[PDB]
């Protein structure tokens, strides 16, 4: 339901997850989900218009086999060289693991320290550097590097962190 | 995908092996050492998938090789070895607990049914 609107749409496609969701240039509001084997073009995961329209994108997403394990995903960079598109987007996984895409490609794997994360954000902090903030529900967190994934700080307490 | 995971691993050998037949004591280290947490990497990679029959053929190889480099480094054994066998075989067990005796004899039992990554498995 919006402001803009104010009237309680359904969703029209049945999907099971909404792992993200946003809006992205030229397509306005989406919803990344999926409906119900290496190949990376065939994906099993529906991107979504928000408001009934095209699923827009079924190319460049996730394999099929990891998205059984994925239980958040979090998107850093879309562009459009056509009608498809290209995503970096980063994952992360029932077995402790944050992952990079780029057009489907897997690259790039971290292990964290903890388990079972529920969420992650970046941090820019000064020059050339960057950092994946993961949360747990152990209520413990961690900080990942860029550009190398792998585990710089570590903490355990915290009720919040912003 | 696979082709990825495949061509990552055939690099690292052969990164291992260009070091293994140059190189001074301290060159070979750093390339050595890079292989190996290359292939640390791409160990864990391979363990965040669910283990589908086409994949356990790459997932023993490198272990294998992990093994070996590592041991060679370090010029002796460990048990983390034997963990990482048992969680291989674990794998192979999933796909179709105890101690290492019994997860053996279910394993050959289980590879006896004639999925065919014997060459690897007879290595491990």
Not at chain 1, 76 to 101: M, P, V, W, Y
Request: glycine residues 6%; neutral net charge; aromatic residues 8%.
């Amino acid at each position: 339901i919006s402001s803009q609107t104010g009237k309680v749409v359904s969703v029209s496609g049945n999907f099971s997850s909404i792992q993200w969701a946003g809006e992205i240039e030229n397509l306005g509001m989406v919803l990344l989900g999926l409906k119900e084997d290496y190949a990376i073009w065939n994906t099993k995961f529906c991107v979504y218009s928000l408001e009934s329209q095209e699923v827009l994108s079924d190319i460049y997403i996730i394999p099929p086999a990891y998205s059984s394990v994925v239980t958040y995903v979090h998107i850093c960079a879309t562009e459009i060289i056509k009608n498809q598109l290209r995503i970096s987007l980063i994952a992360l996984t029932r077995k402790n693991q944050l992952i990079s895409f780029q057009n489907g490609t897997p690259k790039n794997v971290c292990q964290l320290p903890f388990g079972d994360p529920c969420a992650v954000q970046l941090m820019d902090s000064g020059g050339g550097n960057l950092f994946f903030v993961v949360s747990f529900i152990s209520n413990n967190a961690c900080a990942v590097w860029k550009e190398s994934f792998q585990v710089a700080a570590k903490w355990e307490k915290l009720s919040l962190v912003l | 995908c696979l082709d990825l995971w495949r061509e990552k691993n055939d690099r690292l050998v052969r990164q291992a092996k260009v070091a293994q037949n140059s190189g001074l004591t301290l060159r070979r280290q750093q390339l050595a050492q890079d292989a190996l947490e290359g292939l640390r990497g791409l160990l864990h990679s391979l363990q965040g998938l669910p283990a589908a029959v086409p994949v356990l053929p790459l997932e023993l190889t490198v272990t294998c090789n992990f093994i070996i480099l590592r041991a060679s480094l370090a010029q002796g054994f460990t048990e983390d070895q034997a963990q990482d066998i048992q969680r291989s075989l674990e794998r192979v067990l999933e796909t179709q607990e105890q101690g290492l005796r019994e997860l053996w004899d279910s394993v050959l039992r289980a590879s006896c049914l004639l999925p065919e990554l014997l060459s690897a498995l007879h290595r491990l």
